[PDB]
């Protein structure tokens, strides 16, 4: 399945794709008089898409032995080998449900009877299939992917048994472990580390050597498997936030120096990220950690390496975003939002250890939210640990909106699902989109000089992945976009413009006019 | 609060706005080899907006003495005269929360810093304020609008008392009551009928005179209030679906005669609609009735009168269109959708006497729904009647979806609110937007012959209002568009294009690139 | 509406009720072989019930100006003076719904056909009517009760208005305010204190003079009105648990001395209690405070003054107890019970600052809970403050039970209501019952000696009220019962035995046999 657009904006050459595009926008300036001044903005571009996708993509997850890690590898094997499995409801076939890049579709246009015609998200342009993912990684635990899969209690027993043979062969490489960055209760799982002293005890000494190790591990993995492309995705337990101290991790030279001196400010995630950047490998942070300190970000810009991340954005977080937006777009003013969640996996255990979307929506509607009628919105996030629930997550949200004439509206949302079975599919999307973006270059074409300038690459921070990130990383200055649906459309239009197609207008003048 | 855009596509003259716009789309063809051939299409237009908005807008509601009717008149007066009222929470100020046209916002562009900039939905172009609404109408019950509130039990007691003086002076004109079109017999509540024989009893005879009677009321209302524009909206109890037959109510001329012949296939709504069309007055159907039979449609096309409607989109039904779209757009395949509603309005007793979105979503993604994994989605809607709940309706939805590897996701939606407080604000939007389209005319540009033909009005059926309509009617052959968000965006780009602004793309190339 | 029972166990003389009763029970001892040895038990008694109920019961509430305090006085005036009020749903008559003692019924037996016959809970024996309640009390805030209502936002605006005249006449007496005993600082809300130094500021010194003063308040209140009987109920914000030391709290003589020494361990509640006990007036602690320390208890024993309470039981807590017991009573094993609640009352502050029934069920079933299958049950209660909710409280419980053959059951509860409208009704019961027990004296019957012993009143600590207390303090040694239903039956039987009626045994041999 493929798509071909007949447009004079797209041309080929040496197995590549060149396309012109006029980026239209507009700058605004509010007048104290209460008048908006909009001045349209135009900027022609020329995008180059590397039409040669890797025959096999290399994926290295930090926390391979975890729920997502094991589930990911499992999904890849089951799907690639069509490993059907027995279930209480009969024999089921493997699939990537939950993956918008694998099971979603986009509207290309209309047909004869002016009806909308859709095509798979990955049919517009060549993208790497997860079935071609060569997965490996690190993890402070030596349990093979079969054992790791059993303790995760995520997949059917039968499916696990049919994958047992293969899974048992995959062992996660030893990793870096600095106790002062996670739950004090990890000393038992931590039995697969590279940072061990002469005797054999965990040590935060020799961080630079650790970085050297991860670098080598990347190289070896890429060598053992005739691979050219590799992607590092952090899916390990959450680390504690790190202090951004000046003269330590604020600039490039400092960061690397800090590591060499084993500065306390350097977390293991910091080392993994740095090692990935130094190897030209795109690093993706799927955890709530300020891993990308100004130092690393600077190093990324320099090396021209890709970095994206900060929390995988759960499926429930996506709902809260949609619901909230919906209400406010309809003129409904939510006054209170209660979100109480609780699960029982090793993830929610690390959280409970004894030792903003809503904000943007408010600033967008000064009608409902202002000093005269109120500019605040109560919201609380709760996450309790309940082991006797398993990976099955229970999400509960309560929206109390203010309606016309003293009226009120209360919406109760009860979400229940196998937490890992949502994140995994999502992680696949990030991987798929990351490598795709790697094969994309752009040139800011001006009107006065022909062929002026060479092709550049996407800004180090792939904001185009904010759809799968709870805390979208943004370059100094710009404000992150949290509008889920808007992030979804951004992708559509992006893929569209690449094949010579304008933005969706939904004006359907074919029907409304004539 | 106004908006001024700097563009050479907009020129003002004679208090009118002329805007050039290039409409881009694309036809698609599917090849046996599973390939989509996209053929881009372009069509330049020239829209003309009548900047002269009515100083006062005439609104005539059928069933003006009901929940929505009484509540609507209340909101207008409360907001127009700033009638604050006492509540359990204290003194409150009236507003139009729930009204997207009155309390929502739109993105105009970005500011210097690079942040987004929003403006009220009705700030781009001049629109009629509900504060300038002159409401009147018909109803089979003579009770004045004050008594209407008391029995409706929708607004705060205090507010009702502060509006008692004014409300009690508003009385609904006698309406047409064919007991054969309403499930429950209402001859006692119907003490305000026009169709009475010499014995003073209700009869379905002389339907033509009934039609003239209505046309007379439309004429009287317009003169007694010195009004120009007038809009009729149906908010009366649901009628039974009429039958479509050749020579009867299929052709324009057939309908007219079928009326003079007092045919059994002519409902009072059919009459009200026809009368509205015969007066060049736009008619809207806020009820689930095939009132716009092919006869009336053609009737409208001839008269050049705007029509649209068929059931008012409720609040819960919107959450459905949102959630459902959300999931499938995320690659999640829903398989079970069960909705259960129940309230206690007067209409709740009418729906107690017996005589889609999910579809468009299934056809959009053939990856999840095909002849191999399942192309069906069990959906059921059960609306009971619980008088001991007042205007407060309780809705509950249960979405059961299949996840990756035999996974599952169960989402429960519990919505509670005073139904009429959601519909009223919605009705206001229909009226505010309808009168707008009345001041809009376009001209399909001919590349060969300039100034070819003259400005035309929208196709009688205003699908642009399908955002507020549950079962939007369309042109013969065309498929309905229920995507809530897609309908919303349609309105955006429509307003944006009239001021010389391109459709939103959310590409934000100022951050992603450079 | 009284109940006459023909019995040789009940004798009415000199306006008093003498009833005989044989208390049957059983002692048990476990055997090594797992065999249970039950040894029956019997003990004859003779109860004397003072049939002279007060014409007017005196109630003094500590925290009169609070939500419950204001609502209680209001409920009394509304019902007493039949103050009907207007509401969004028409005129409504005042009642005591939520009060089992005032609105529940009991089974007296069968009839001719053999059908169950019920009678109001307060018709078997003479009980005080809340309509005869003369209320007064203390509060650190001087706002009159009318202003108290507006601040509580609990009752309908109209009702508050119709009670404005009478409510404005009620003002709470100055109370004792020790700032170091309240979580949230309240120096701005506190303007009605007695503990003021000569200069005129709040001080914790001179606690004994403070007690003397409160004694005066009780004496005056009693003299002021023609009251002989008076009860004190604490409904003020929660204090901090005062640690118990062997030199101050330990005994009666110490407590009194400690008070004279202004010991930091003497809280204002401690004083109010002592003051109440010293006046022969029963004290009820309606908050989670170890007010009743050993010292106080002993004092109550010496003076023979009744005391009881320790945190008012919530409708939320009551419900959790019912389901919990229900599930276990059906052989179902609940493994996880999550509870999340949030409100916006003033107490929300005292429940937010920088300051089990489940266990009994588990221990009552070694079949479901044991060292072989599991003896634990994850439970957790979360309470959040959400001002934009008013008096309304949103409770959510999540029970995850275990079924057979790997089965599982999930029950999601969602309770919503005005927190104070359920509590107020409960406080009334406590008062009604507390005064009832006051007129109850018993005498143990010695089979070998006639008329042996005198009639003794209930043990200072009233447990028959546990139905309304979450943390019912029990005499040293015994274990507190938390099974709601059982507490209900305890009351049923007690009232029945008093009128000569057997225990309740649903055995219907008049149907099951013969
Ligand atoms: N599952 C979801 O739905 C979801 C949603 C949003 C975010 N996340 C985030 O994704 C991450 C993974 O969650 P999970 O549910 O898979 O947890 P998990 O317990 O199953 O796995 C995390 C793994 O990390 C390993 N690990 C810990 N420290 C490490 C280190 N220094 N180096 C290498 N490995 C290390 C652990 O041994 C463990 O196997 C978390 O950071 C979580 O907050 C998950
Ligand atoms: N109330 C809501 O929130 C809501 C939301 C979505 C859709 N709707 C739709 O709106 C319609 C009615 O809404 P309502 O809330 O106004 O109901 P309603 O019962 O409160 O009032 C309808 C009014 O119309 C009058 N009436 C009945 N037959 C009539 C006739 N032939 N001509 C003139 N008047 C007539 C009735 O006596 C009554 O006063 C229904 O079709 C319903 O499905 C209502
Ligand atoms: N309201 C309920 O539903 C409910 C349910 C269970 C338990 N309780 C218990 O009862 C208490 C009352 O709760 P509320 O909801 O009525 O709070 P509230 O704020 O409405 O009223 C408490 C009142 O106590 C007064 N007060 C505080 N400290 C005092 C002192 N030292 N002496 C005299 N008055 C004092 C306050 O000024 C206030 O008017 C809580 O502390 C709580 O532990 C209440």
From Swiss-Prot, chains A, B, C:
Tell me one Pfam family matched here. NAD_binding_5
Regulation of protein activity: Competitively inhibited by myo-2-inosose 1-phosphate, which is also an intermediate in the catalytic reaction. Competitively inhibited by 2-deoxy-myo-inositol 1-phosphate (dMIP), 1-deoxy-1-(phosphonomethyl)-myo-2-inosose (DPMI), dihydroxyacetone phosphate (DHAP), 6-deoxy-D-glucose 6-(E)-vinylhomophosphonate, 6-deoxy-D-glucitol 6-(E)-vinylhomophosphonate, 2,6-dideoxy-D-glucose 6-(E)-vinylhomophosphonate and 2,6-dideoxy-D-glucitol 6-(E)-vinylhomophosphonate. Inhibited by 2-deoxyglucitol 6-phosphate (dgtolP).
Q: Which reaction does it catalyse?
A: D-glucose 6-phosphate = 1D-myo-inositol 3-phosphate
This enzyme's EC code(s): 5.5.1.4
Induction section of the entry: Induced by valproate. Repressed by inositol.
Q: GO molecular function: any one?
A: inositol-3-phosphate synthase activity
* Main localisation: cytoplasm
Q: How does activity depend on pH?
A: Optimum pH is 7.2-7.7.
Under which pathway is this protein filed?
Polyol metabolism; myo-inositol biosynthesis; myo-inositol from D-glucose 6-phosphate: step 1/2
Q: Which residues bind NAD(+)?
A: 65-68, 139, 175-176, 186-187, 189, 235-238, 286-287, 311-312, 314, 345-347, 390-391, 419-420
List modified residues, type Phosphothreonine.
39
Q: Which domain of life is it from?
A: Eukaryota
Residues modified as Phosphoserine: 168, 175, 287
Query: Could you give the subunit structure recorded for this chain?
Result: Homotetramer.
Q: What is this protein called?
A: Inositol-3-phosphate synthase
What organism does this protein naturally occur in? Saccharomyces cerevisiae (strain ATCC 204508 / S288c) (Baker's yeast)
């Amino acid at each position: 399945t493929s798509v071909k657009v007949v447009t004079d904006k797209c041309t080929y050459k040496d197995n590549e794709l060149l396309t012109k595009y006029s980026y239209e926008n507009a700058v605004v300036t509010k007048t104290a008089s209460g008048r908006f001044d909009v001045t349209p903005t135009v900027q022609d571009y020329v995008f180059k898409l590397d039409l040669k996708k890797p025959e096999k993509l290399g994926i290295m997850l930090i926390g391979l032995g975890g729920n997502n890690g094991s589930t990911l590898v499992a999904s890849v094997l089951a799907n690639k080998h069509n490993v059907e499995f027995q279930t209480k409801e009969g024999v089921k076939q493997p699939n990537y449900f939950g993956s918008m890049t694998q099971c979603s579709t986009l509207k290309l246009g209309i047909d004869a009877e002016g009806n909308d015609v859709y095509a798979p998200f990955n049919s517009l342009l060549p993208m790497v299939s997860p079935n071609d993912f060569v997965v490996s990684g690190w993890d402070i635990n030596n349990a093979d992917l079969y054992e790791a899969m059993q303790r995760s209690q995520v997949l059917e027993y039968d499916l696990q048994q049919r994958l047992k043979a293969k899974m048992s062969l995959v062992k996660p490489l030893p990793s870096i472990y600095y106790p002062d960055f996670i739950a004090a209760n990890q000393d038992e799982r931590a039995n697969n580390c590279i940072n061990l002293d002469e005797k054999g005890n965990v040590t935060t000494r020799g961080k630079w050597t650790h970085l050297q190790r991860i670098r080598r591990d990347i190289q070896n993995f890429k060598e053992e498997n005739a691979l050219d492309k590799v992607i590092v995705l952090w899916t390990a337990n959450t680390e504690r936030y790190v202090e951004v101290s000046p003269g330590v991790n604020d600039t490039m030279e400092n960061l690397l120096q800090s590591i060499k001196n084993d500065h306390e400010e350097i977390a293991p995630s910091t080392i993994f990220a740095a090692a990935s950047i130094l190897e030209g490998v795109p690093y993706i942070n799927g955890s709530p950690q300020n891993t990308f300190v100004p130092g690393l970000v600077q190093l990324a810009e320099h090396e021209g390496t890709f970095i994206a991340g900060d929390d995988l954005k759960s499926g429930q977080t996506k709902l809260k975003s949609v619901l909230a937006q919906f209400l406010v777009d309809a003129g409904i003013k939510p006054v209170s939002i209660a979100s109480y969640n609780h699960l029982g996996n090793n993830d929610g255990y690390n959280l409970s250890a004894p030792k903003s979307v809503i904000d943007d929506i408010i600033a967008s509607n000064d009608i409902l939210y202002n000093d005269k009628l109120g500019k605040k919105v109560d919201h609380c996030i709760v996450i309790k640990y309940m082991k006797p629930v398993g990976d099955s997550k229970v999400a509960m949200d309560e929206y109390y909106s203010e309606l016309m004439l003293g009226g009120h509206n209360r919406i109760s949302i009860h979400n229940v699902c196998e937490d890992s079975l949502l994140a995994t599919p999502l992680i696949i999307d990030l991987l798929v989109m990351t490598e795709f973006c790697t094969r994309v270059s752009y040139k800011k074409v001006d009107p006065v000089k022909e062929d002026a300038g060479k092709f550049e690459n996407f800004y180090p921070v792939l904001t185009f992945l904010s759809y799968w990130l709870k805390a979208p990383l943004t370059r100094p200055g710009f404000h992150p976009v949290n509008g889920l649906n808007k992030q979804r459309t951004a992708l559509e239009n992006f893929l569209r413009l690449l094949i010579g197609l304008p933005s969706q207008n939904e004006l359907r003048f074919e029907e409304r006019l004539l």
